[PDB]
Amino acid sequence: TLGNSTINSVVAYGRWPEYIAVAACRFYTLDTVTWRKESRGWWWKLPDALKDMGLFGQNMFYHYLGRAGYTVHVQCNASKFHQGALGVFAVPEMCLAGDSTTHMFTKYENANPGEKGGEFKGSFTLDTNATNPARNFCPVDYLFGSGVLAGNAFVYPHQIINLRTNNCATLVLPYVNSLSIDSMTKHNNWGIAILPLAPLDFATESSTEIPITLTIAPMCCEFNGLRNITVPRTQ
Amino acid sequence: GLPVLNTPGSNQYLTADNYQSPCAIPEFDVTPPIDIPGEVRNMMELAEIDTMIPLNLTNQRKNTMDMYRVELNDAAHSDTPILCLSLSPASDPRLAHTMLGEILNYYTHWAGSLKFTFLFCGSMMATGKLLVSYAPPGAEAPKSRKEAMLGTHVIWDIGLQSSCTMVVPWISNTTYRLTINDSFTEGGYISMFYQTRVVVPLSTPRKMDILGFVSACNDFSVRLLRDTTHISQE
Amino acid sequence: GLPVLNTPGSNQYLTADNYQSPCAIPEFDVTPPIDIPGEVRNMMELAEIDTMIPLNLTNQRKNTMDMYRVELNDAAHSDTPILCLSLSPASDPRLAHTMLGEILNYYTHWAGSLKFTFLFCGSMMATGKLLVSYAPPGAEAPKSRKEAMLGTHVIWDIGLQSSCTMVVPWISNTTYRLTINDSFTEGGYISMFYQTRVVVPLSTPRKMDILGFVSACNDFSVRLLRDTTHISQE
Amino acid sequence: FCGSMMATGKLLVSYAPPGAEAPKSRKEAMLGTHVIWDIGLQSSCTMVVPWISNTTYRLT
Amino acid sequence: RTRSESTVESFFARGACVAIIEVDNDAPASKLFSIWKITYKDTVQLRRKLEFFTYSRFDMELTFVVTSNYTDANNGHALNQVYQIMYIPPGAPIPGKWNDYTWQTSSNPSLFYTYGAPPARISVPYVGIANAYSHFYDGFAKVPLAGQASGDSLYGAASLNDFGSLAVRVVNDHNPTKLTSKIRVYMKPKHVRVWCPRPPRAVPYYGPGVDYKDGLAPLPEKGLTTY
Ligand SMILES: CCCCCCCCCCCCC/C=C/[C@H](O)[C@H](N)CO
C-alpha cells in the first residue's frame, strides 16, 4: 500500500528507493494495451508516462528539478488453457533508435508519448519523406530498439510473466542517474519494455486477445525549484 | 649528474604499460562520486547473468524473435533429439552472442562450470518429462536418448516446475579452453530428448515453446584479454 | 651507470608541468618582502566584490555611462517588467564584463550562489515598492508579475532603504555549469517589477535611476583554467 | 465472485470522497482510494471506506 | 583461479586509438592546423567496450604517436619538426589561423612535441560536471515550450560530454618542401568505476547515438539439431 492506493517482486540492483510530493506519489493506472498473437511489444518512459497523473504531473511541471523511484506492477491474467510469456524489462537511459538517415533526429513530442507509450516493430523501416519527416522512433524488437540483441536484455532488471505460472510482475526501480537530481521534463530516467518472449496462443482460436495493465507508483519523490508552470509543446 | 645507463626498451610505447605521466590540469577540484545503483567490479559478474540463447538459428528464424523459441508438440514419444548444442561458449554461433559469449570473445582462455536453464512456456494443462544431457568430449555426438542417457543428465518434469537448470561442471584435460573452435580443447555436447511425450487435454494448444538461458557459475574465470571479432569498422 | 628506461612522454614540454630547473643566477640575495596592503590569495576574492552591471546596453547607451542606469518613473502601476536578465554570469553580455564575469571567463566550470544588489538613486521624497524575482530554468521566461511572483523573490521598499540585495541560491541539475551559453546548464531568469508604483510629491523629479551590482557568495568556486575571449592580439 | 473456478480477472474497487464530479471512467476512479481484486487469487474482497467528513456526523 | 584479469580496471587497461589528426607543414589546399573535438565515438572498439555500462568514472591517459613524411621524392630535405597540441576547453577562443594569437596559450594547457621523441603522454583526472560520465542520455538539452516556433535540440545530445578540443599545428616555419604529419591519439581509462551493465552493441554503429542503419542481420544460420 502506497497512499490511498493498494495493490515475484524484484528490487532493481538490490537497492530500494531512497531520498537524497507525498500525496501526489501513489499508484496510477495507465491505459490498458491488448496482447494479440501478432503483437511485437510495448514501451514507456518514466517519468514521461506519469506526466498527466493528478498532482504528480503538476509537481513535475511546476519544479525545475525532480527525482523519484518507481514501483511498476504489470497485470495480465488468462486461463489455464492459455499459453504465452512476457518479458518486462526496466532499462536505465533507454535510448531508442530513430527512423531517418539523420542521427538523433527524433523530435521531443515523439520521444515523450505519455501513458500510451509506443510499440516495437518486427523489422526496420526507413522514413523517406524528406519534406515532412516523421522524426519518430523505429525500435526493432529483436534489436531491443537500440542495436543490441534482445536475448541479452535480461542483464537489465526484469521479470517474466509466464501465463502457466503467474499473472503479474512487480519491479521496484530506485532513482538511477549520473546526478543526484535532474530535470524531469528534459530527461527520462527509466524505460519499460514489454516483449512477448513466447507468443500468445489459445486452443483452436486465431482470435484470442488479452489485456495488459500497468500500474506505476512514484516513490521517494523530491521536487525543488518552484517557478511558473512548464507547458511543453505538443504535436 | 647521476651516472645512468639506458637499457633496451627505452623510448618505446607499449599500450599495456603502467607508467606515471604529468597532469595536464593541475589542482582540478574533482566532483565526488555518488552511490549509484548497479556498480560492477568484474566482467565475470556480467557473465554470471542468465541471457536467452538464440537456439533456433534457421534460415527463416535467425535475426528475429523466433530464433529464441524451440517448439515442442504433443506427438508420440520418439528418441530423436529436440536440440543439440556444442559446449563451445565463445565459438558456437548459438552461444557466441549471449552475454557470456560476448564477454568470452574479449578473452583467449576460459575455465569453469556453466549453467543452462530451460523455461517451458505452454499451458498449465500440459504435462511431460524431458531429458537434458551433457556428454563430455571424445566420443561421437549422441544421436538418440540411449546414448545421451550414458552421460551426465537431469530429468525435467514440466508439470512439476516450468524452469529447470542443468549445471555442466568443468571437465577438461587442459586447465583452460580456448575461446575459438579447437579440437584439442573441445567441450562436449548438450542434448535434449523426450523422456515421456508431452500430453495435453482437449481444447488446449498442442504446440508450445521452450526458451534457453545460459550463464557462468561462480568458479568461472577468463585470461589473456584480446580484441573481439564481433565489432568492425569500415 | 644505473639502469634506466625512458618512458613515453620523455623530452616533451607540457606548459602545465611542474618540474625543477637549474638556477641561472645562483647565490642571488633576494630583496625581502614588505607588508603591502591589499594582498590577494584567491581570484574568487575578486569575484566576491560587487561591481556595477551594465544593464542598459541599448544602441545609444552601450559604451557610455548611461549603460549602467535603469530609469524608473512615477507612472501608473503596470505588470510590465523593469529589467530582464539571464542567469548566465559569463556569457550574458550584461554580466560577462563585470569583475565576476571577467574572472569566470578564465575558467570552464562555475558553481555557487550569486548576489544582486540594487541601489535606488532618486530623491529622498520618493516612495515605492518593487519586486525582484529569480525563476529557476525550465519554464517560459516570466513576462508579468503574476508569473514572476511564483519563483523566489523579495520586496524592496525604497522609502525604507535605498539598497536591496537578493541572493540567488545555487540550484542546478549538474554539479557545475559551463561558462558559455548552453541549454543543458542554463541558470534561470532575474526580473524586476513594480509591486506598487513610484510616488513623488510636487516639485520633485519624476524620473530617477537605479543601479545594479553583482558579486559571488562565499560558496562560489570555479574549475578548469582556460584562455579568455575578452582579449585578442592583432 | 460467484463464477467458475476456471475464471480469472482483475477488478478495481474505488471510493472517491465528495466534492468533485462522480467518476465515470477508470482514469478518474483510480485517483481516489481503491483496491485491486484478483478473483483467481480469492473469491471475496473487502474494501474499507474510512471515515472522511467535514462534519463530525452525517445526516441519515 | 582468480579473476584478476577480468576486473573492470584490467578490462580497460589498454591504450586505444580514438583519433588520427592530420596536419601539414607547407607554405600558405593544405591544412596548417587541425581541430579535433575530444571523443571516443570516432572509433568502435573502445566505444563498444565502454558501452557495456551506463555510467562511468575514471581518469584518462592520452598518448600521442606522431608520424610524418615527405610528399614528393628528392624535393629536398627538412629540419626536425616541432608540433604544438593545445587543449581548448569549451569556451576558450578557437584558433582560426596557423599564426593567430591564441597559440600563445597563456592559460590553455599545451604540449610541444619534438619529432623522433617517444610518443607524448599526459594524464587528466575525472573532469565530468556530473558525478559520473553518461554513455547514454535519454533526454534533450532543451524542452520545447508551447508558444515556441517550429527548443529543437537533438535527441540525446547534452553538454555533459563536452570536453573541448585539441588544436594541432607544426610550430616550425614552413619548409620549402611539403610535409604531412599524422598524430594518433590513444586513450587509457584509469581507476575505473562503472555502473548499470548493458547488452553489447550487436550491429554497426551509426552516428554518436544508438541509431542503426545497416548490418541488422548479424547472426548466422545454424541447424537446431546440429552440434
Ligand atoms: C596539453 C595537451 C593536451 C592535454 C589535455 C587533454 C584534454 C583534457 C581531457 C578532456 C577529455 C576528458 C576525458 C573524456 C572522457 C570521455 O569522453 C567520457 N567517457 C564521455 O562520456
Side-chain angles (χ1 to χ4, degrees), chain A residues 42-63:
Chain A
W42 304 268
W43 57 265
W44 296 267
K45 300 293 180 63
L46 292 175
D48 168 54
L50 308 177
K51 69 189 170 185
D52 300 333
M53 289 299 182
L55 285 172
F56 182 83
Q58 296 298 304
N59 278 253
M60 267 180 65
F61 289 117
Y62 266 112
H63 294 85

Side-chain angles (χ1 to χ4, degrees), chain A residues 100-142:
Chain A
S100 66
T101 58
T102 305
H103 313 142
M104 300 158 291
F105 200 41
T106 301
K107 74 206 309 308
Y108 179 93
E109 297 105 64
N110 294 327
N112 295 275
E115 59 167 320
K116 62 185 171 70
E119 293 173 5
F120 287 92
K121 316 297 181 304
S123 72
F124 181 73
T125 301
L126 192 67
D127 179 62
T128 56
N129 190 331
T131 318
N132 173 16
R135 303 188 59 183
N136 194 18
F137 287 139
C138 184
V140 179
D141 53 359
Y142 78 89

Side-chain angles (χ1 to χ4, degrees), chain B residues 24-25, chain C residues 14-15, chain E residues 38-40 50 56 58 60 62 64 85-87 108-111 122 124-125 127 133-135 160-161 163-166 187:
Chain B
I25 308 173
Chain C
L14 174 71
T15 61
Chain E
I38 298 165
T39 185
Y40 61 76
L50 281 166
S56 67
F58 49 75
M60 178 56 63
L62 296 186
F64 305 86
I85 305 167
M86 182 168 60
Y87 174 37
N108 288 2
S110 194
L111 198 58
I122 60 94
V124 291
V127 289
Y133 296 133
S134 290
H135 305 156
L160 44 66
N161 65 251
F163 308 104
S165 297
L166 297 184
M187 277 185 185

Side-chain angles (χ1 to χ4, degrees), chain B residues 18 39-47 103 106-107 220-226, chain E residues 1-14 49 52-53 189-194:
Chain B
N18 198 11
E39 190 171 8
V40 177
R41 319 295 169 76
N42 211 279
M43 306 304 292
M44 287 298 94
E45 297 168 5
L46 306 201
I103 301 292
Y106 278 106
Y107 288 88
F220 209 91
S221 74
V222 291
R223 304 193 313 189
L224 187 37
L225 180 74
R226 61 158 185 94
Chain E
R1 289 183 293 94
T2 195
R3 292 170 168 182
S4 64
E5 200 173 353
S6 53
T7 65
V8 168
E9 193 73 18
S10 297
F11 186 71
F12 288 107
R14 293 294 192 279
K49 288 181 68 177
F52 268 87
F53 308 91
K190 300 180 62 171
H191 312 104
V192 181
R193 295 181 67 186
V194 283

